[PDB]
Structures are given as structure tokens and as C-alpha cells.
Amino acid sequence: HHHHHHIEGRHMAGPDRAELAELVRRLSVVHADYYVDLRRATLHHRASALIGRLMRELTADWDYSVVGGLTLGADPVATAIMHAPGRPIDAFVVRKSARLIEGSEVTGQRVLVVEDTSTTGNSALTAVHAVQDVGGEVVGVATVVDRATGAAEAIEAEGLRYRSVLGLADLGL
Amino acid sequence: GPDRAELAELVRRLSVVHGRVTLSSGREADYYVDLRRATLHHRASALIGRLMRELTADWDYSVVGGLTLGADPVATAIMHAPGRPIDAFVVRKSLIEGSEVTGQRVLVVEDTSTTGNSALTAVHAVQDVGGEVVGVATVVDRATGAAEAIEAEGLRYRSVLGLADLGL
């Protein structure tokens, strides 16, 4: 039973989104019945370049100067966004225990929290808590793949905007 | 020339953090070094990726990575910088995540090493799953013996910047 959620990424249809979905299938989906290892894609030279480009487009109407999330999953997503062409965006990392925020300053800034894929939503909310605790303002949460697990709804239930590039249909699942 | 100077300036300004601090050692000081402020900055990280590829251009490797958290933005900066395809990985402590290193030639990276233990922990993790480590590269060497520790294991060690570049 899936909790199907809106994939705002469907509106960015085009060559780059299809190329990424094909990479995610080839790198990350192993046919349990199957399992998914997104880190193979977020740490791949071409999939990561597409992730940075597409996650900027996905969030082009949101105001933020810094991007980051909970280690380890968020980290290559945030750095792909920082490195992608466009306006200057800096990065941070939230540690899982401990200064929980490393990297660029988030105090007084508008921040995008990212994940590769949210499992329960807790990881995103943990990053949000950390940012808000030091005076950052979270504009929303963006992910690469939404897996219809209920995490989206759990995030939105706490007042946060949520968007993803790809959904379960894009994984061939 | 110009790129290396631009980076050294960013590293002094972003990562040599001024102000009175009791260090980890318990000893007081007038600054500490936090390379993450540079490795997670839009321009410093672009320069790091570019200069680290130039620094290791004669080495043959298809994957780059090191011990979390310090190595991670260094490896991804390499991967995202223009040039031939290089994929990335991350070493966790008590396991390799990301791109496959088994059977591959691998560059181990660190932002800055003190003892060399973090980098050698990554080198051993890689070797333990069949990766062949071609060398270790770091953004900043701080003349602390890390180079010697790494070379003592038969590995080449290179850094983009040295302790002189930090303007202390």
C-alpha cells in the first residue's frame, strides 16, 4: 500500500529529467523483490550533475541562499545544487549527533533542506530543527525521489513545503 | 597561478577563524582552522575541485572519496569539476557508500589532515574491499606529520596548499 504523493517534478518534463530517471533505475534499483540504493546515483558523476540542475529548477520560485540536510544522505544532493550553474548558493551539513551545523552560516538566512529520499520524514524534520535552533529559516524541503511512504505528508503536516523531482513510477516500481 | 591564489585567500578568510578559544587540546589560542567553511562554499569548492584534479592529473583513478565528514565535499567537488568522469564514495566509521571501489583505482582525499589517521582509516577501508589506492590528496597540509605517516605506508601524498598559505 503506497501513500501516493504529488511529484512536482512531473512539470519539468524534458530530456534531463528522463536521463536522470534512467540513471537512477540503472544505478540504484536492483530487481523484497527489489531494493533501492540512491547513494549510487547521488555520488555518480552524471546523475549528480543532473540532480543539481533539476533540484534548482524544482525550487526556482523559492528564496534561499544556503542548502543542506541531515548527513549522510543529504550531503551530495546539497553539494550538487551548490555546484550546478546559476546564482551562488552555499552548502551546509547537519550532523546526526554531537555545533550540529557544519559549513556555511545559516543564522539569519533562508535555507532549503534537502534529502535524497525521505524514509519516515524524521530526518528532514531533524535538519529543520537544527537550522531553526540557530536562527535559520527553512523555506521548504526538496528531495530527489519520493517513494510514497508517507514521509511527504509527515513533513507537510509540520507546516513545511515539500517537492520531489521523481516518484515511484520513475523507478519502474 | 591565479586559481591557487584565489583559493588560498578564500581559505584564510573563511577557515582561519579568529577569536579567543580554548582549543580541543585544552590549550587557548587566537584562532582555529575550520576547512568546512571553505569546502562547503560555492566558489572555494569549485576551485578545490579544479585544483585537486590538476594536482593529481598524472594519477590513474576512476573514484574519489574519504572519511566522513571532512572528505565528502572535497570528493564531490572533484566529481563536479569539469574533466573526465570521476565518481565519488564516502567511508563511514563502524563501510563504503556510493560508487563501487572494489576492483577500481581510487584517490583518497581529506580536507586537512593532522595525524593522517582519518585518511589512513579511509585508505584501509578501501583496501579491505579490494580498492587499489593510488595516493592521498588534501586541500591543506599543516606540517603536522601527516605526510610522513601516509608515505610510511607506501602511498604518495600531495596537497594543494601548505601551512605558509594560511598566513599565520
Numbering used by the authors:
A (entry chain B): -10 to 20, 31 to 97, 104 to 178
B (entry chain A): 3 to 96, 105 to 178
Reported in the publication:
The fifth step in the de novo biosynthetic pathway is catalyzed by the enzyme orotate phosphoribosyltransfrase that synthesises orotidine 5′-monophosphate (OMP) and pyrophosphate from α-D-5-phosphoribosyl-1-pyrophosphate (PRPP) and orotate (OA). Herein, we report the X-ray crystal structures of MtOPRT (coded by the rv0382c gene) in complex with PRPP, inorganic phosphate and an exogenous Fe(III) dicitrate molecule (ferric dicitrate, FDC) at 2.25 Å, 1.90 Å and 2.40 Å resolution, respectively. In all the structures herein described, both monomers composing the functional homodimeric unit are related by a 2-fold axis, with a solvent excluded surface between monomers of 1045 Å2 (13% of each subunit surface).
An analogous network of hydrogen bonds occurs in the MtOPRT-Pi binary complex, where the inorganic phosphate occupies the same binding pocket of the 5-phosphate group of PRPP exploiting the same hydrogen-bonds network. Refinement statistics gave good correlation coefficient score for the Pi molecule (CC = 0.97). The analysis of the enzyme structures in complex with PRPP and Pi lead to the identification of the molecular determinants responsible for ligand recognition and binding.
